[PDB]
Design a protein around this nucleic acid. Structure first.
Lengths: 48, 97, 141, 37, 48, 33
RNA sequence: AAGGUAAGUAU
C-alpha cells in the first residue's frame, strides 16, 4: 500500500495455459520443419 | 517315457531351427545345442545384414531353449547326477528365472 | 494407378528396363487395389509428366507378374524400384533397405528429388545414391 | 510351470503361423486420409 | 498518425500498450492499482 | 514392347543380367538346391 | 530384431 507503506496483499503469478500451448506449438513447428536443416539453425530457433 | 519324448522334441526343435538358420544357404550362423545363436567367425557387415531374423525366430529359439533346460534337468535327475529334491528346486529356479 | 503404363509379364518388365538408355526406369511393384499402392501410384501420376525428360514410370502387378518376387523380395504391400541402363540402383534411404522404397510417400516433391538424385548418381556411374532426405524417422511431431 | 504354460497356449498360434508361412513353398507378405478421394 | 496522436492526448491512459509499460509491468501496475484502492480488501459490510 | 506376349521358354531373370538381393533370411522362400 | 549393406571395374 503506497499510503501506509505496509504489507497488505500478496500476488501469485502463473503462466497461462494458452502461453504454454503457444510455446509448445512453437517448439513443435521448430522441430517438424527441421528435416534438411542445420543443427545450428534448430538450436538457434530453440534458444530464441 | 516322458524324458525320452523331451529329448526327442529337443532334438527335433534343434533340427527345425537349424533348417531355418540355413534358409538362404548361409553357413556363418551356428546354433549350439543350448540354443544360442552365434556367428562362426567375425562376419562382415553385409553378411551380418544378410543373416537377420525377426523377433519371432528368436522367441521360438528361446522357448525351445527353455524346453531344453527343463528336459536337461530331468535327464540329469534320471542319470543320477542330482537328487529329486534338487530336481524340484532346479525346476522352481528355472520357472522363477 | 490406372493412368500410368502397365507391364503384364516378366518379359515386358525386362524390355522396359532394357529399352531406356538415358532415363531411369521407375517401376512400382504391387497391386492397383492396395491402399498403399494407390497412394504411391497417385503420387507417381502427379509427378509422371514432370519427370518425363529423365524418368519413365511403369506399374507391375506382382500377382499377375510374380516373376521377380523371389529375387527382388517383392513381398511388401508396395515397392518402388529404380533401374538405369539395365542396372538396379540402390538408395541410402536410412531405412535399412537400400534396394527399394517400400512405403507410400505423401509429398510429390520428395519423389522428384529421389528420382533426380538417382539419375545424377547413375549417370555418374554410381550404383548407390544417398537420398537428400533420411527416412529413418517420419519426422512426426 | 503353469504360468509359462498359460503363456504357451497364447504364443503357440503366433509361432505356428510365422513358421508355416515361412518354410512353405510360397511366401506371403497414412492411408486413412488418402482413401476416399 | 501515432506521432500526432501522442503529441495530442488522443488515447487516454487506459489504452494499452502505452510504450511505457511492458506487459509484465502492465500486470504489476494493475495489481498495485488494485491493492491501492480505498479499503479494497474489506468485506465487513458485505461489499465485494 | 507393350502388349506383346512373352516368348516361350524365357526366364524373366535371365536375358537381362539381373541379380537378386536379401535384406534378411526371414523373407522369401527357402533357397532350393 | 532392426533403423550400421560404400559403389565400381576384372576373372
Amino acid at each position: 500500500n503506497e499510503v501506509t507503506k505496509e504489507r497488505t496483499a500478496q500476488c501469485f503469478l502463473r503462466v497461462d495455459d494458452e502461453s504454454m500451448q503457444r510455446f509448445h506449438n512453437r517448439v513443435r513447428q521448430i522441430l517438424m520443419a527441421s528435416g534438411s536443416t542445420t543443427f545450428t539453425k534448430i538450436v538457434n530457433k530453440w534458444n530464441t | 517315457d516322458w524324458v525320452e519324448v523331451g529329448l526327442q522334441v529337443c532334438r527335433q526343435g534343434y533340427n527345425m531351427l537349424n533348417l531355418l538358420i540355413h534358409r538362404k544357404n548361409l553357413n556363418y550362423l551356428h546354433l549350439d545345442y543350448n540354443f544360442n545363436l552365434k556367428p562362426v567367425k567375425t562376419l562382415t557387415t553385409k553378411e551380418r545384414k544378410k543373416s537377420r531374423f525377426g523377433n519371432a525366430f528368436h522367441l521360438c529359439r528361446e522357448v525351445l531353449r527353455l524346453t531344453k533346460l527343463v528336459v536337461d534337468s530331468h535327464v540329469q535327475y534320471r542319470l543320477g547326477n542330482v537328487d529329486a529334491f534338487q530336481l524340484a528346486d532346479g525346476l522352481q529356479y528355472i520357472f522363477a528365472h | 494407378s490406372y493412368m500410368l503404363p502397365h507391364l503384364h509379364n516378366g518379359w515386358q518388365v525386362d524390355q522396359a528396363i532394357l529399352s531406356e538408355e538415358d532415363r531411369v526406369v521407375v517401376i512400382r511393384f504391387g497391386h492397383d487395389w492396395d491402399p498403399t499402392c494407390m497412394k504411391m501410384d497417385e503420387v507417381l501420376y502427379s509427378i509422371a509428366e514432370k519427370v518425363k525428360n529423365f524418368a519413365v514410370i511403369y506399374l507391375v502387378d506382382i500377382t499377375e507378374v510374380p516373376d521377380f518376387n523371389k529375387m527382388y523380395e517383392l513381398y511388401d504391400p508396395c515397392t518402388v524400384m529404380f533401374f538405369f541402363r539395365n542396372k538396379h540402383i540402390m538408395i541410402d534411404l536410412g531405412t535399412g533397405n537400400n534396394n527399394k522404397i517400400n512405403w507410400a510417400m505423401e509429398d510429390k516433391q520428395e519423389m522428384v528429388d529421389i528420382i533426380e538424385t538417382v539419375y545424377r548418381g547413375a549417370r555418374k556411374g554410381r550404383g548407390l545414391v544417398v537420398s537428400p532426405k533420411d527416412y529413418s524417422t517420419k519426422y512426426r511431431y | 510351470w503353469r504360468v509359462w504354460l498359460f503363456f504357451m497356449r497364447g504364443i503357440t498360434p503366433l509361432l505356428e503361423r510365422w513358421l508355416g508361412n515361412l518354410l512353405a513353398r510360397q511366401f506371403e507378405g497414412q492411408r486413412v486420409e488418402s482413401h476416399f478421394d | 498518425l501515432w506521432y500526432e496522436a501522442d503529441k495530442r492526448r488522443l488515447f487516454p491512459p487506459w489504452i494499452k500498450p502505452a510504450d511505457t509499460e511492458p506487459p509484465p509491468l502492465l500486470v504489476y501496475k494493475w495489481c498495485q492499482g488494485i491493492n491501492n484502492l480505498q479499503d479494497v480488501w474489506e468485506t465487513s459490510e458485505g461489499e465485494c | 514392347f507393350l502388349g506383346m506376349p512373352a516368348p516361350l521358354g524365357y526366364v524373366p531373370g535371365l536375358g537381362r543380367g539381373a541379380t537378386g538381393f536379401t535384406t534378411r533370411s526371414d523373407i522369401g522362400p527357402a533357397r532350393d538346391a
